[PDB]
Amino acid sequence: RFLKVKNWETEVVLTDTLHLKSTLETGCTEYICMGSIMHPSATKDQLFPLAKEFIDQYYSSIKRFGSKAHMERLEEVNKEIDTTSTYQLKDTELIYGAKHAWRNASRCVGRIQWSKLQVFDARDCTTAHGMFNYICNHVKYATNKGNLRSAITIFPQRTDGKHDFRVWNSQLIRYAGYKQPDGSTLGDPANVQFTEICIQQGWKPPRGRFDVLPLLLQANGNDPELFQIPPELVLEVPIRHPKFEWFKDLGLKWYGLPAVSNMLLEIGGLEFSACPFSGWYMGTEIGVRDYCDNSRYNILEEVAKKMNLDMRKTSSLWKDQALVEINIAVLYSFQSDKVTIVDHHSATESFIKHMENEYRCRGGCPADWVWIVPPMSGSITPVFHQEMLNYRLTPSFEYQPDPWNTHVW
Amino acid sequence: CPRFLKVKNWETEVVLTDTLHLKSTLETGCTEYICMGSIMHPDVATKDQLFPLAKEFIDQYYSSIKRFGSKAHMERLEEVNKEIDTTSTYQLKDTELIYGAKHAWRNASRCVGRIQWSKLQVFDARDCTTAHGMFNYICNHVKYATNKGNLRSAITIFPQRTDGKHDFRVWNSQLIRYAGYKQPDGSTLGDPANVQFTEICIQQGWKPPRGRFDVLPLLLQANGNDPELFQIPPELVLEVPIRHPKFEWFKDLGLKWYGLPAVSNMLLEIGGLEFSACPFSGWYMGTEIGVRDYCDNSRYNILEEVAKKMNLDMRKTSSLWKDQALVEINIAVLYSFQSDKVTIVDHHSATESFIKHMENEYRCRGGCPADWVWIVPPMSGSITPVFHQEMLNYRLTPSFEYQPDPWNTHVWK
Numbered sequence: 001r002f003l004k005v006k007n008w009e010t011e012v013v014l015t016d017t018l019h020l021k022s023t024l025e026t027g028c029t030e031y032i033c034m035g036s037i038m039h040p041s042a043t044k045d046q047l048f049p050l051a052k053e054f055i056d057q058y059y060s061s062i063k064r065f066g067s068k069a070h071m072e073r074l075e076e077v078n079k080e081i082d083t084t085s086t087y088q089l090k091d092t093e094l095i096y097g098a099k100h101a102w103r104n105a106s107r108c109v110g111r112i113q114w115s116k117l118q119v120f121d122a123r124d125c126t127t128a129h130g131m132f133n134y135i136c137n138h139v140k141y142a143t144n145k146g147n148l149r150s151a152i153t154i155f156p157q158r159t160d161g162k163h164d165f166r167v168w169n170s171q172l173i174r175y176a177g178y179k180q181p182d183g184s185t186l187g188d189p190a191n192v193q194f195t196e197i198c199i200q201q202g203w204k205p206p207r208g209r210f211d212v213l214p215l216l217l218q219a220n221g222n223d224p225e226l227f228q229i230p231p232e233l234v235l236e237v238p239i240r241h242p243k244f245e246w247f248k249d250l251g252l253k254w255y256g257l258p259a260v261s262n263m264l265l266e267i268g269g270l271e272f273s274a275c276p277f278s279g280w281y282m283g284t285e286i287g288v289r290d291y292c293d294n295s296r297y298n299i300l301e302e303v304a305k306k307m308n309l310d311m312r313k314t315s316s317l318w319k320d321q322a323l324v325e326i327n328i329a330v331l332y333s334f335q336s337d338k339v340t341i342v343d344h345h346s347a348t349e350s351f352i353k354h355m356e357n358e359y360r361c362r363g364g365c366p367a368d369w370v371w372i373v374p375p376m377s378g379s380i381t382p383v384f385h386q387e388m389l390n391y392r393l394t395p396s397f398e399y400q401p402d403p404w405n406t407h408v409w
Numbered sequence: 410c411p412r413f414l415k416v417k418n419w420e421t422e423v424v425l426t427d428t429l430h431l432k433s434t435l436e437t438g439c440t441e442y443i444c445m446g447s448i449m450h451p452d453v454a455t456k457d458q459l460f461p462l463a464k465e466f467i468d469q470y471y472s473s474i475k476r477f478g479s480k481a482h483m484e485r486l487e488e489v490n491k492e493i494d495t496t497s498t499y500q501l502k503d504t505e506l507i508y509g510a511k512h513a514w515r516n517a518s519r520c521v522g523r524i525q526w527s528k529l530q531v532f533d534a535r536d537c538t539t540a541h542g543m544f545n546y547i548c549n550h551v552k553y554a555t556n557k558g559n560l561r562s563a564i565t566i567f568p569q570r571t572d573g574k575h576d577f578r579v580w581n582s583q584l585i586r587y588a589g590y591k592q593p594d595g596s597t598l599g600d601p602a603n604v605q606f607t608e609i610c611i612q613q614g615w616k617p618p619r620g621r622f623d624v625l626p627l628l629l630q631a632n633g634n635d636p637e638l639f640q641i642p643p644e645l646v647l648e649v650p651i652r653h654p655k656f657e658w659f660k661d662l663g664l665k666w667y668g669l670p671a672v673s674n675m676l677l678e679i680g681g682l683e684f685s686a687c688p689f690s691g692w693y694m695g696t697e698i699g700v701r702d703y704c705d706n707s708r709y710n711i712l713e714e715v716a717k718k719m720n721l722d723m724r725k726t727s728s729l730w731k732d733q734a735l736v737e738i739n740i741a742v743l744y745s746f747q748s749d750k751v752t753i754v755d756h757h758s759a760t761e762s763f764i765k766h767m768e769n770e771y772r773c774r775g776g777c778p779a780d781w782v783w784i785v786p787p788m789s790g791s792i793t794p795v796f797h798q799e800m801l802n803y804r805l806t807p808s809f810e811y812q813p814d815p816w817n818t819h820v821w822k
């Protein structure tokens with residue numbers, strides 16, 4: 001059926017037909033909704049229909065569906081699956097597939113940019129040193145001296161599952177976290193486990209609050225190897241406040257390049273277990289989640305102190321006051337250093353325009369409201385009032401288990 | 410359906426196990442291929458439709474009082490069955506009516522205030538026959554629930570639906586709300602949310618003061634008759650002028666709000682019976698007023714005026730002037746209610762209590778249905794603990810349901 005979504009602020013109604021293309025599960029049923037669960041829920045015979053589905057939509061996308069080239073490609077793919085139990089994507093298909101995985105990412109508010117994505121084909125890589133080289137080139141290209149450019153680097157696809165390429169880091173650039181004898185945590189508590197693994201593998205830790213972690217890289221199923229990203233490639237921003245001259249004394253900083261490296265890219269039944277991709281930050285990612293989550297840097301209290309807020313009662317909203325000032329500081333700092341960043345107002349506005357585009361040209365846009373709405377000031381952004389339909393389309397980015405929970409050394 | 414579904418809190422690592430979902434009775438709108446979790450809303454019961462709905466409820470009631478399978482249980486079942494058989498409907502006992510109302514609240518997945526569910530004063534108004542009688546019942550409810558600022562949660566329940574042509578309805582969406590008036594120039598005075606209802610009241614004979622905070626009259630329908638207008642005695646309507654602890658100028662904005670949130674357009678379903686007029690009230694979470702009522706673009710929309718008075722740079726969005734003003738407005742609302750000793754709860758306290766409530770429900774009841782999209786507050790979401798809490802949404806009965814606006818269905822006499 002045709003499904004309608006309404007914006008309750010503007011009363012705009014859009015009609016979704018694109019959901020009729022989904023063949024993957026969301027996790028919900030008729031009787032239970034799992035919309036707020038973070039992670040709900042080949043063979044030759046499994047592989048060909050997936051391959052075919054994808055080749056078909058590619059040839060449909062370039063308006064040569066049912067052409068000689070299309071027919072020929074299907075036959076070529078079939079033979080390849082027969083003789084080798086898999087197949088290799090064309091360069092054009094790899095690029096189409098990676099852009100569409102981003103386009104289909106229901107949780108991403110930045111998708112208006114989806115067709116501007118620099119794709120680096122790294123399928124000829126064989127060793128962790130090669131992975132390191134490719135990742136350095138990615139970081140340098142994407143960073144671009146502060147004028148950030150969206151990019152993805154794609155390593156060889158899974159074969160038997162015993163020879164996976166994996167970036168063990170959850171992001172290319174992250175700060176270490178250390179357990180202290182007195183029970184507290186220095187640096188980023190999110191990365192304590194990963195940090196311990198690096199240390200055991202031989203990394204010499206500086207034991208600071210913002211130590212850039214080394215890369216831990218796994219090629220062809222072999223044991224992962226450590227590498228230090230050259231420091232001149234790691235762009236960072238000291239956080240200061242435009243009004244509070246004391247804010248810089250907090251000693252806060254962050255890195256300019258958000259580069260998620262732990263997801264799995266699926267295109268046409270093929271699985272790319274190492275596919276680091278990066279765009280640029282939305283301010284709240286750092287200012288709200290990274291700095292203010294209780295389980296992260298958890299800085300609200302320190303900031304509220306310097307602001308001399310009365311922190312005795314929750315109803316003083318001292319947390320909300322400090323939260324805004326911290327996010328002002330992050331935006332101000334990235335902007336002053338000419339490092340690309342977007343605020344949550346601008347970002348969500350662009351997303352609404354994006355949805356409108358996709359409904360017109362594509363018949364819809366899968367979107368996860370739980371993730372799209374920013375972690376602060378929700379209802380003063382336009383996405384809060386926008387009904388969204390969430391459904392799964394392929395190509396897609398997927399969660400995968402942490403490699404230390406699967407790897408035999 | 411798997412017997413055990415786990416939910417996780419990503420902040421605390423606490424894992425809860427839900428079995429109560431197996432008792433789900435209605436559809437969510439989601440399917441295996443699509444989720445409609447952010448969709449706002451995704452001729453009577455026949456005898457044969459009514460029997461099993463009633464039995465399900467009666468069984469649940471007797472199981473709750475630890476008399477399942479008892480002689481009193483079996484006799485009640487037989488008496489209900491005979492009544493349906495001979496009259497096509499049945500009447501709830503007062504005990505069942507109270508239990509039913511409390512459980513509709515306990516089951517309301519969108520409600521963050523449910524730690525309070527068992528403390529609900531239930532007013533049985535099933536003897537009511539006229540709009541004047543409805544008015545009397547509603548005045549008493551307002552006075553009791555208000556309690557001079559020490560608010561007490563309450564529900565008043567009018568006669569259930571019969572053939573669908575004799576419905577009792579409160580035409581208001583809440584017992585107390587402010588009028589809205591569309592001007593010839595396109596601007597709106599008062600609350601733009603209530604323009605349609607206000608126009609209906611005016612057509613019915615209401616004489617509007619045409620101010621910014623005019624308390625609307627009650628428009629009350631009894632036994633399917635045409636609705637009738639009444640003015641709530643102003644001494645029954647507790648209001649709070651909004652001021653700020655730091656900004657002396659804030660009072661000069663002339664804002665105020667009413668103390669009692671009393672939703673009156675929902676339908677209460679118990680054992681297949683339909684109570685189309687069941688106004689209920691609790692007390693406010695501050696963000697309901699300070700974020701939504703005041704700062705929604707389609708409501709009072711005061712952010713700009715406050716920002717100006719705060720002397721903020723409103724030229725770029727990235728100065729976060731809107732966010733800054735929004736916090737000060739919510740501080741003012743909480744400060745003003747607490748100063749006037751009118752019950753209100755801030756979003757940090759409310760969400761913290763809800764997590765405690767949910768954990769208790771998982772332990773005593775096997776689960777707690779919750780709609781994350783509604784439970785997470787409209788400001789500062791991720792610094793409240795509910796943001797980090799996985800939830801399962803499903804529909805249990807008794808329940809509060811949406812129903813069509815009565816002016817769209819009413820057959821004018």
Ligand code: HEM
Pocket residue numbers: 098102105107108109110111113117150151152277278279280281282285342347371397
């Ligand atoms: C260009 C600027 C971009 C912006 C401003 C942006 C913004 C965001 C934000 C704020 C989130 C939520 C992240 C979180 O809360 O952890 C997100 C999620 C996501 N983004 Fe984007 N993004 C951008 C580019 C990209 C690119 C280039 C890709 C892939 C090629 C991508 C793929 C994804 C995916 C797969 C998720 C969801 C991950 C998950 O399910 O856990 N994004 N995005």
Ligand code: HEM
Pocket residue numbers: 514517519520521522523525529562563564689690691692693694697754759783809
């Ligand atoms: C006692 C203090 C209470 C508090 C603090 C509270 C809090 C809330 C809040 C903040 C919402 C979201 C409202 C919105 O965004 O429009 C809500 C929704 C709701 N509440 Fe409660 N509530 C309370 C009492 C009650 C009572 C007494 C009942 C019924 C007997 C009730 C039933 C509901 C229902 C059915 C919804 C969902 C309404 C809808 O889907 O449109 N609540 N509550």
Ligand SMILES: CNCc1cc(C#N)cc(OCc2ccc3ccc(N)nc3c2)c1
Pocket residue numbers: 110258260262263278279280281282285398399400
């Ligand atoms: C650990 N928090 C949940 C999470 C898990 C995974 C995985 N696997 C990826 C995630 O991706 C977040 C993400 C992904 C892509 C982004 C692109 C740009 C940007 N600014 N942020 C972006 C943020 C998030």
Ligand SMILES: CNCc1cc(C#N)cc(OCc2ccc3ccc(N)nc3c2)c1
Pocket residue numbers: 522670672674675690691692693694697810811812
């Ligand atoms: C148009 N706004 C959405 C909406 C629709 C309906 C209906 N029908 C009811 C609604 O109820 C909101 C509600 C219900 C009960 C409450 C109890 C206490 C409280 N503080 N707020 C409370 C708020 C909301």
Ligand SMILES: C[C@H](O)[C@H](O)[C@H]1CNc2nc(N)[nH]c(=O)c2N1
Pocket residue numbers: 035036037038370371372419796797798799800
């Ligand atoms: C439990 C809940 O689903 C979880 O905390 C989600 C909520 N929404 C989110 N939204 C974004 N953008 N990022 C997140 O990590 C989360 N976390």
Ligand SMILES: C[C@H](O)[C@H](O)[C@H]1CNc2nc(N)[nH]c(=O)c2N1
Pocket residue numbers: 008384385386387388446447448449782783784
């Ligand atoms: C489109 C979206 O479902 C809609 O704006 C919802 C979002 N969450 C909400 N949450 C609450 N508490 N109240 C609301 O009115 C809404 N509106």
Ligand SMILES: [Zn+2]
Pocket residue numbers: 028032033034035439443444445446
């Ligand atoms: Zn769902």
